[PDB]
Amino acid sequence: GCILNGRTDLGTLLFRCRRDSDCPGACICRGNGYCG
DSSP, X not given: OOOSSSOTXXXXXXXXXXXXXXXXSSOOEETXXXXX
């Protein structure tokens, strides 16, 4: 889905996005509880 130096949909980042930092590409840590 995304890709630009980061943890695009990973194990821990799988949810509760610890921070938008885990979302390099379009993906981003939103209230949804993940780098959506």
